Each structure stands twice: as structure tokens, then as C-alpha cells.
Design a protein around this ligand. Structure first.
Ligand SMILES: Nc1ncnc2c1ncn2[C@@H]1O[C@H](COP(=O)(O)OP(=O)(O)O)[C@@H](O)[C@H]1O
Ligand SMILES: Nc1ncnc2c1ncn2[C@@H]1O[C@H](COP(=O)(O)OP(=O)(O)O)[C@@H](O)[C@H]1O
Ligand SMILES: Nc1ncnc2c1ncn2[C@@H]1O[C@H](COP(=O)(O)OP(=O)(O)O)[C@@H](O)[C@H]1O
Lengths: 721, 20, 474
């Protein structure tokens, strides 16, 4: 009774846990009450309970600091009880741990402990380890003496002492600066999926021994370098406690014949002896490339050796093998057969939200100035991966150190804590780092949950509603579709002039549905045809299936018809190798996988009619140039971020810019915004955009869609009636 | 109890100032 | 298994393979199972190394040695019967073979029931629903599905009660049931391994699903059923039974359903060949796949092998113009050859379909091939009503819906176009029902509105061409 499952917390605070209300009522405790936590090896912790809408009823959410003190790991269970008899302390003695007091001196109490405890009212217990972050260092402290016992709340009027040599870490506790799950920024969904696959086999091996179910024995992670493939594999081992063995392709292959096979076998034998264990094989495509792509006897032998060692995992109890590759189809297909590596997770590239999370993670210890805006950085760092974002944070820290601290400190090993903590990193230091760094993954496809909302689209009121009926209704009201024998549509094709919002429509529905948006462009479909690599069609649809829920957007759907000649071509049809594979993958996709396909074309008259048959992109929506009322909405929507002067007549502009697309109206607003900003900056060497700024912007703005292009689109739309 | 509610108010202030 | 033998050094792989046969003899009667056979004995053209060639020869000699190793049977498993050294299939050795393939909906249900024998299921669990939804799954996927569904239920209850120990109290498992939401959840997380494989099964299309065409239904029965239901009457009268029929006419009139429905009533395996496959074979110069298609049809007999979009290759070559040559190509040559070599008594019937018969090599229609031809026109007044009734057989329809009136309006529509109207009316009823909660049946207003969006897919220019062709054939 009163037992709760240990899981991660959103709140990072060293004394806060979160429960779901039904457990707070059964435990007879209220929001803000102090509770005691009973873990393993006669170890306890004291904390305050809050609540949120994310914790499940059976779980208790806590951070790493609390789990370390209780000597528990994610997936374990602890007892919780209220303790309303908690009172304030009088005197406590807190000392740092030697593991973190390396290269730092000075008055650690005034720099760390006093800001940490002063007006903080934190519950503490004798033996509690907690981490205080600042000055670009993470220093952990232990409570060694308290007048009240075993626990008390530290009030601002209590006496806190800190005298004595740093404490050597005990073998029953781990360093709080070790890699864990809270060091992984983007790809949180992928980490959650892996946790479900791995944490239980390793944390509770007794359940798999007794219950007739098979654990995963091999997980393949893939994505560009620098995205966290090795960080996840190590973080999982550190959190579950399994021994981590490191293998990499090129090192094993650099050995002589017979040595490469022996070394690979030894790693597996050591994992069994140290089970539970995780074997991580990096650059899997280098150690075990496709045999149909190899020539040498050693190349075929090392693949066979890995295949037998993977199969031997039925006898090697509690050993899970993880592997990392750049491309899921660059490894011998035998490795992905039932057993062996029967699970895989698409790590990919962090999106704008993930990039911000990574920047926040690698600034935990950094003191940032008020002018620092990490969201602005995350939006500028397109094509960057975690390896690049970490570099940006460290480089910004170094520049702040060289500007200030090198005028204070000597070329030595030890720096005063006060000097380090007095340093703040400004936005200029981050912008400098951005000029020095270069994205390592700029061309690879990035999957993101878009931030486009319905309020971002001017006009098209009926199309926005239509998409909700096409995408949300089949899963929000499935009983009505069954009742009337309706087959939900699998996708819709948009056609019309460019720059009218086709992209926003696909993103906006993905946004409200909280679905991943996958952008496929014409050049990808064109490359597949000419390079005779149509197998990449399966990769696209497989990404959608693994990214589900998602919206898979195929731009420039006409690119295939054009490649066949478009306006003229030969005497045949539009069918070809690439579209044949696309149609096959669509037909085999189930609507219950929460994958919706949206297409777009600027030449609908040449689209292979096959794509418009039932089961494919059977629905057709015309997106014309915005009309008078829509153009006004577009202009006003773009200006929501900047005050507009009363002398600006946006309705007049809409009445004049009759041939302008939504893309062209955006340039007008954005150009007028830039002009107003320039004047504002110059005034200090203004509060709103003036009519003069719009009139000047109109001197450069032009319509992108000609009159003849409009007639072509209108005549086609009329032809379809 | 009352000392715990003051501890909760301090924890809520720290979490909101840093997260918001 | 292949990897275990191939990973061994030269001389070790041959010795270990020989020992396996010696052990089977000493312990005879014995069975030797060689998994991943194609890893040890791949088609010769795929390997040139001295070590790989020797181990293949060693397997061949050990197989022949089974004349002395009494009571030893060697079984082997491969993914494709044509990926291995053809010498293995010589009289003796591995001359006998069995096609395991993939399970159908009935087999999948049986597999799910087996891997749930020990599982506690809730009253809401419906394994027939799962078996029908698990398209493209094999038994190993269904076993993984059962495991994943159990693991979800285990996390919900086993971790909730905190049963952390080396042993599990039997009482806990006895009350730990797996619900239908746990199977459906696991289905969303799983990924079929055989999604792209050819599916060969008896179709579920019945004659009641096809509106109109009463005479075509009877014609297919005479062509497909009578040659095997009354084989003595064909002999007595000297009849030469047709081996196939080609369907022609406007698109969207039921050509595919006709082929499936006759396969269903006859309980024959239906094999669907579509344009994309015919196009791939032509474009990629891989006409050898035609022989594999017909060979599978023979193995699956009795079966109906349906070649849709026969004109897709003619169109690829330019259709009406093309180059200066004729109507021959690599793929049609193999198709015609396999037709001529098809045994009358193998119970393999060929059905074709085209929308442009005028551009298909007429040789395909010679006696012994697709000698029968059936015209499928646009449905008439009584057929269109029958089509609407069939399409709506799965939904509630209000009594105010006048299907005869609607059929009279859609004079130029195909069956495919009548279906669009039915689905539009269903969508409108769904929209109305959902809005009422923010209705019990489809109302006439929903059909009348749908009628204003649907159009005929086949114009009068195409019907006249079809009629003239049909007239030429009498
Ligand atoms: N997804 C991620 N989230 C947070 N940090 C990341 C992520 N991916 C990479 N990093 C950081 O970037 C660096 C990656 O280096 P390393 O662990 O060697 O990975 P790799 O396999 O890319 O070489 C580390 O400092 C790590 O913390
Ligand atoms: N209806 C609209 N409302 C608001 N902005 C629009 C609209 N249509 C286009 N835009 C602007 O034009 C830009 C291009 O839109 P997009 O749909 O990507 O054009 P395309 O995909 O045809 O090149 C977008 O960034 C958006 O800001
Ligand atoms: N006679 C008919 N009865 C019922 N439905 C029909 C009929 N003809 C066509 N249909 C509808 O039209 C659709 C297309 O039929 P199909 O024979 O697959 O066309 P094709 O063979 O030209 O691809 C089917 O899904 C079916 O619902």
C-alpha cells in the first residue's frame, strides 16, 4: 500500500515530486504538504508534493537527485507517506563533494549554498545529496549534520555552516553529473519508445523470466551524426544500471583477419558475464555492410560472425544489443530479420523545439544575460544537430570567460568561485559562436511538429474546415464512419497558383492534430527516377509510418509527369517506376496508423489520374489567389507582431494588390516592418509602422503570378465543375 | 501543515520564475 | 544455420558440416534442419570464392551420402526456392519442397489463438477482428503482437501492485487480463514484415456484391466451373475448354469484381497482377518474372490468375504512335509462351482486362489463350439501381431515398461513379450526425446533394469507340 512507480519529472527542483490527484486523495495529503519517500537500503528522502496534468495515477514523478538519494532507478517503486509534523531546522552543516570541487576555490557557501537555501524553505534530510548549478559549474553537496533529525525545513533564519575538506564520494551513490535522460534534448518521443522497450527487461528481469513473453534483444537507431544516437544508448545504460560495452565498426575492421572476429566475440562474452548489459555497436554499416555489396572473404565472415552472436542472445540472459547507423538500409538485411535487430527507432534531426531544448540543456550551468534569447538561436540554427548546438553553448561560454575573467585570473588550474559566478554570457557571445559554427546536417530531411496554426492563414475559411473533416473526424468519431459504411479518405491533392498557403494548410492541420509534418519535395521524387533508386519511396512512407501520427506532404506532385515530358512527352501515359512504387505504398497503408497524405501541384492537368482514384488522393481542393477580403486578412495577420499606425489603410492596399498572392502580401508587410525597425534603430544614433513604410515597401513588391497563369488555373477549376 | 505550505510556495516561485 | 557454418575458417566449415551428418547417423533416426540455406548454398552465379564453392560441393556430397546414412532426413529453409544452387534439387537431395507462404485471415486467427492459450483475455477481446486487421503480418508478427499486448497489460497491473520479487504470485496473473485496447494499441506499434509480399488467397467478393451483368455472371460460371464440374461431358462432345477470357469496355464497370467473384464461388486462389507489375517488368527488362508469376499460379492451383491493365505495356511503348516497330516486346513474349505451355488439367484459369483492346497484340486472343471476349458496357437502368442497392448494403438508408429516380438521372455513369455518390451521401450523413452532438440514417437530401458533385467518368467519345470494337467482334 502507498507504493508508487518511480518515473521522470518535468519539474527539475531538488525537493519537488508530482502526483496525480487520485493518489493525493488516497494518501490524505494536499498540494504543498511534505511527504517522506522510502527507497532501498534503508534510505529516505523528504520532499513537497505538487500536482499536474501529466503524471499518471500509478506513478510518482521525481528528478535524478531524489532517485540517487533513495538508491532507486527509473522503473522501481517506493513508499510514500505524509509527515505533517515537519518543523524548521536550527543549524545545518553542508559540505561539497570532492568530485565536483575540481579547479574551483573561494567561498562556496556564499556563491552556491546561500543562494540555494536563502528564502528557499527546502526540506532536507541527513545524508541528502543535492546539486547547485551556477558559474558554469555543477557542484553537489551533502548534508552531514542537522540539529533536528532526521529531516527538517531550512528557513532563511537558520544557521548554515560549511567548514572542512571536500567529501569523497561513497560507493553507494553516483555522481549527479553523469549522463542521464535529462541530458537528451530533442527526440523525446523516440527516447520514450526506447524506454518502454528496454527499461523493463533490465530493471525487472524476474518478470520476463516468469512471464511467457520475449524481451527485445536488439534496437537499431539511425539518423545523421551528432543527433544523440550514442548519447541515448549510454544514457539508457546509465539509468538502468546495465553494463555498457562499446563497439564500433571501423576499429573492429582495422584488425587483422581473425582478430576482428575474436574481438567481436569477446565483447559479447563479457556482456554475459556482466549481465544485465547493453552492447552498443556504432557504425553498424561499417562492421556489417550488405554482403551483396562486399567482395572480400573477411567482409562476409565478419557479417556471419555478428549474425551468430546476435542469435546467441537467446542463451545470453539479460543482454540487449543496440546499434547505430546513418541509414537504415545500409546494413545487411539479415540483421533486421525476426530476432536479432527486430526493433528500430528513427532519431533523425531535432526540430526547432528540440534545438531549443538542447540549448537549454547545455546551458544548465551557464549564467545568461537578460539579452540572451535561446529561442531566437534555435530558429536561426537550421541544419544543426546536438553536436553543433553543444559547441555553440561552449563557445559562447569561452568568449564570456576570455573577455572578463582573463583580466582577473592567472594561467593556473584553480579559479575563485565568486569570479566564475560573477560572469554572464551575453547574446553577442552566442551570435559570435553562430558565425563560427557550420551545420553538419543541412540537407537531410527534418521531421518536425509545425508551429503553424489556423490563425496564421488568411482566407480559405472553407478549406480549413474541410481538412478538419478529412483528417480529424475519421479518428474523433469512428463510430459514425462505421455506422454509415464510409471509407475515410487517405489524402487530398491541392492545386492552384503558387504562394496561396498550400504549405500552411498541411502544417496547420498537423499542428492542431499534434502530428509530425514530413516535407517531401519534387527533387526527391525526380532523383529517385533518374538514379534508378525507387526503393527510397519505401523509406519515405516508412518514415511516415514510424513518425505517426504524421502528415506526409508531397510537394510538386507534377514533377513525375514533367519528367516524362509534361506538356509533350511520348505517346504513353503518366505511369512510371516511381509513381508505381508510391501508389503501391499508399494502397498498403492503413488509415488506423494515423498517417494522412497531402499533395500539392501547380500543374494539375498533367497529374497521373491513378493518384486520384479511391484510396489515393481522391479529394481535390482548389486554392485560388486570395480575394479582396482574404487579402486584407493576410496583410493584417502578418502584421500581428508589430503595431500598425492609424494612417495605414490596409484595406486600400488589398483593393489595389489584386494580382498579388499571399506570398507577395507577406513580403509587403515584412518589408514595411524592416523599414520601421531601421528608423527605430537610427533614432537612437518608431513605435509603429507608418504609412510611409508601406508606401516605400510597395515600390519593391511585385506580383509573382501573371495574368495568363491565373486564367490557366481558373479554366482548369471550371473544367472540373 | 504550515511550514510545509511555506516550503511549497518557495518551490512554486523557483519553478515558475525559471520555467516561464 | 548458414551463419554458423559460414563464419568458420576454411576447413572448419566443411568439417563442422560433415560432423552434423555423422551425428545424425549415429543417433538415427534423425532430422537435420539447415536454416538460411541460401547463405551456405546460394545460386552459383552469386559466389566465386574458393571457400564458398567448396562448402557447396561438401553439402552436395553429404546429401548424396544419405543413401548410406539410413533413416536420416534433411530439411532446409530458404526465403526463395530459386536463390539456391539448382544442383540441390536433383532427384534425391532436395527434390521435394513445400511452399509455406504466409497465412490468410483464417490462419492468422488460428495463430493468435495459439499464442494466447496461456493468456487471460477480457470479455471485449476479439481475435477475429485482429486477424482481419493484421494484413501483411506473418506468424512471428502475430506472436510479437500477443507479447506486446500482454506487456501493456502487465505494466498497467503488475507494476501498479508493486510485485517486485523473483517469483510472481499466481493470483496476480490469474486476474491480469489483456483488453481489446491493448491489442489495438500493440497493432499500432507493430510493423508487418510481409506487407509488400504477394498475397494469394480465396477472395471475399461474392456475386451479390456486383450489380447487374446477370449474363456475364453465368458466362464466367460456364467458362470456369463446367470444365471441372462436368469433365465427362466435355469429353463426350469433343469440347475444347477455354483457358481464359479477356474483358473489355469502359473503366469502372466491375471487371475486377467479376474475376474475383468467380474465384470466390469456385473456392480458388485469386492472384492479382496489376499494371504497375506489367510496367515494371517491361521497363526493367525483367521478363523472367512472368514465368515466376505463372509458376506460382500453378502451385496455387486451383486458382484464377487475373492480368489487369493489359494495355499498360502498349501505352508505355507509345500507345497509338510509339516507334516504327510492332506490338511485340519482352514481356508479352513470355506471357504468350506461358499461356501456350499451361496444362489444361492444372485448373489454372486466366482472366484479362483492358480499356484499350485495340492496342494489344491480337495474338493473345488466339485459340488456347484468351480466346473468349466479354464486353462490359455501362450499366443500364435496372443495373444502376442494383449497383446502388449493393453499395448501400452496409449502411442505413432512409425510406425517402428513391434509388430508381437517382439511377434514371445517372444515365451516363459507370458503377465506379455510382459508388462515389453513395460514399458522398454517407459522408454527408456523418457530417450531419456529428454536428447534432455539438442522423440515424442517410436521408434523400444527402443523395440529392451528392448528385450535384458526381460526374460521369466515361464520355460519349469513348463509348462510341467501345461499341464499334464490340460490333467488330460480333
Ligand atoms: N539529442 C541530443 N540532445 C542533447 N545533447 C546532444 C544530443 N545529441 C548530441 N548531443 C551532445 O552533443 C555531443 C555528441 O557527442 P557524442 O556523444 O560523441 O555523439 P556522436 O555519436 O554524435 O559522436 C555531446 O556533448 C552530447 O551531449
Ligand atoms: N493564405 C495565406 N495566408 C498567409 N500567408 C500566406 C498565405 N499564402 C501564402 N502565404 C505566405 O507565403 C509563403 C509561401 O507559402 P507556400 O504555401 O510555402 O508557397 P508555395 O508552397 O506555393 O511555394 C508562406 O511563408 C506564407 O507566409
Ligand atoms: N457492377 C458493379 N456493381 C457494384 N459495384 C461496381 C460495379 N461496377 C463498378 N463498381 C464499383 O466501381 C469500383 C471499381 O471497380 P473495378 O472493377 O475495380 O474497376 P477497374 O476494374 O476498372 O479498376 C469498385 O470498387 C466498385 O465498387
Amino acid at each position: 500500500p502507498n507504493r508508487l512507480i518511480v518515473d521522470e519529472a518535468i519539474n527539475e527542483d531538488n525537493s519537488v515530486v508530482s502526483l496525480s490527484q487520485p493518489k493525493m486523495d488516497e494518501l490524505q495529503l494536499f498540494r504543498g504538504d511534505t511527504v517522506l519517500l522510502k527507497g532501498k537500503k534503508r534510505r529516505e528522502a523528504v520532499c513537497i508534493v505538487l500536482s499536474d496534468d501529466t503524471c499518471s495515477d500509478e506513478k510518482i514523478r521525481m528528478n535524478r537527485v531524489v532517485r540517487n538519494n533513495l538508491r532507486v532507478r527509473l522503473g522501481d517503486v517506493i513508499s510514500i507517506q505524509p509527515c505533517p509534523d515537519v518543523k524548521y531546522g536550527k543549524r545545518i552543516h553542508v559540505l561539497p563533494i570532492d568530485d565536483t570541487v575540481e579547479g574551483i576555490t573561494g567561498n562556496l557557501f556564499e556563491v552556491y549554498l546561500k543562494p540555494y537555501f536563502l528564502e528557499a524553505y527546502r526540506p532536507i534530510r541527513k545524508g541528502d545529496i543535492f546539486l547547485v548549478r551556477g558559474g558554469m559549474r555543477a557542484v553537489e553537496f551533502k548534508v552531514v549534520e542537522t540539529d533536528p533529525s532526521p529531516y527538517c525545513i531550512v528557513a532563511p533564519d537558520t544557521v548554515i555552516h560549511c567548514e572542512g575538506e571536500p567529501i569523497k564520494r561513497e560507493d553507494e551513490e553516483e555522481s549527479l553529473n553523469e549522463v542521464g535522460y535529462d541530458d537528451i534534448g530533442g527526440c523525446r518521443k523516440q527516447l520514450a519508445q526506447i524506454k518502454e522497450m528496454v527499461e523493463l527487461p533490465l530493471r525487472h528481469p524476474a518478470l520476463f523470466k516468469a512471464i511467457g513473453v520475449k524481451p527485445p534483444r536488439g534496437i537499431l537507431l539511425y539518423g545523421p551524426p551528432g543527433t544523440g544516437k550514442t548519447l541515448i544508448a549510454r544514457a539508457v545504460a546509465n539509468e538502468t544500471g546495465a553494463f555498457f560495452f562499446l563497439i564500433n565498426g571501423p576499429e573492429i575492421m582495422s584488425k587483422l583477419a581473425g582478430e576482428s572476429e575474436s574481438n567481436l566475440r569477446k565483447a559479447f562474452e563479457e556482456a554475459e558475464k556482466n549481465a544485465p548489459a547493453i552492447i552498443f555497436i556504432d557504425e553498424l554499416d561499417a562492421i556489417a555492410p550488405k554482403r551483396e555489396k562486399t567482395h572480400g572473404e573477411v567482409e562476409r565472415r565478419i557479417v556471419s560472425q555478428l549474425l551468430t552472436l546476435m542469435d546467441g542472445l537467446k542463451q545470453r540472459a539479460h543482454v540487449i544489443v543496440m546499434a547505430a547507423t546513418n541509414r537504415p538500409n545500409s546494413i545487411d538485411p539479415a540483421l533486421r530479420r525476426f530476432g536479432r535487430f527486430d526493433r528500430e527507432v528513427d532519431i533523425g534531426i531535432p526540430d526547432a523545439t528540440g534545438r531549443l531544448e538542447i540549448l537549454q540543456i547545455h546551458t544548465k550551468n551557464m549564467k545568461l544575460a537578460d539579452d540572451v534569447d535561446l529561442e531566437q538561436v534555435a530558429n536561426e540554427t537550421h541544419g544543426h544537430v546536438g553536436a553543433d548546438l553543444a559547441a555553440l553553448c561552449s563557445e559562447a561560454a569561452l568568449q564570456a570567460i576570455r573577455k572578463k575573467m582573463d583580466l582577473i585570473d592567472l594561467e593556473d588550474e584553480t579559479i575563485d568561485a565568486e569570479v566564475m559566478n560573477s560572469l554572464a554570457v551575453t547574446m553577442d557571445d552566442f551570435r559570435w559562436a553562430l558565425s563560427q559554427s557550420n551545420p553538419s546536417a543541412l540537407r537531410e530531411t527534418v521531421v518536425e511538429v509545425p508551429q503553424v496554426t489556423w490563425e496564421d492563414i488568411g482566407g480559405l475559411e472553407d478549406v480549413k474546415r474541410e481538412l478538419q473533416e478529412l483528417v480529424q473526424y475519421p479518428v474523433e468519431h469512428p463510430d459514425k464512419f462505421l455506422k454509415f459504411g464510409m471509407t475515410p479518405s487517405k489524402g487530398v491533392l491541392f492545386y492552384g497558383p503558387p504562394g496561396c498557403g498550400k504549405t500552411l494548410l498541411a502544417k496547420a492541420i498537423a499542428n492542431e492534430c499534434q502530428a509530425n509534418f514530413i516535407s517531401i519535395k519534387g527533387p526527391e521524387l525526380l532523383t529517385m527516377w533518374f538514379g534508378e533508386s525507387e526503393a527510397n519511396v519505401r523509406e519515405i512512407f516508412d518514415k511516415a509510418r514510424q513518425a505517426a501520427p504524421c502528415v506526409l506532404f508531397f510537394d510538386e506532385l507534377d514533377s513525375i509527369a514533367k519528367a516524362r515530358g509534361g506538356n509533350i512527352g511520348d505517346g504513353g501515359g503518366a505511369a512510371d517506376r516511381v509513381i508505381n512504387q508510391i501508389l503501391t505504398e499508399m494502397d498498403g497503408m492503413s488509415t488506423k496508423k494515423n498517417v494522412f497524405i497531402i499533395g500539392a501541384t501547380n500543374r494539375p492537368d498533367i497529374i497521373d489520374p491513378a493518384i486520384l482514384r479511391p484510396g489515393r488522393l481522391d479529394q481535390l481542393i482548389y486554392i485560388p489567389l486570395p480575394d479582396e477580403k482574404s487579402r486584407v486578412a493576410i496583410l493584417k495577420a502578418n502584421l500581428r507582431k508589430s503595431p500598425v499606425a492609424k494612417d495605414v489603410d490596409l484595406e486600400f492596399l488589398a483593393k489595389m494588390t489584386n494580382g498579388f498572392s499571399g506570398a507577395d502580401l507577406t513580403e509587403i508587410c515584412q518589408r514595411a516592418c524592416k523599414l520601421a525597425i531601421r528608423e527605430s534603430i537610427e533614432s537612437e544614433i518608431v513605435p509603429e509602422i507608418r504609412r510611409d513604410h508601406f508606401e516605400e515597401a510597395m515600390r519593391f513588391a511585385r506580383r509573382s503570378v501573371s495574368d495568363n497563369d491565373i486564367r490557366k488555373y481558373e479554366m482548369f477549376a471550371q473544367t472540373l465543375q | 501543515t504550515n511550514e510545509a505550505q511555506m516550503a511549497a510556495a518557495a518551490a512554486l516561485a523557483r519553478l515558475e520564475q525559471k520555467q516561464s
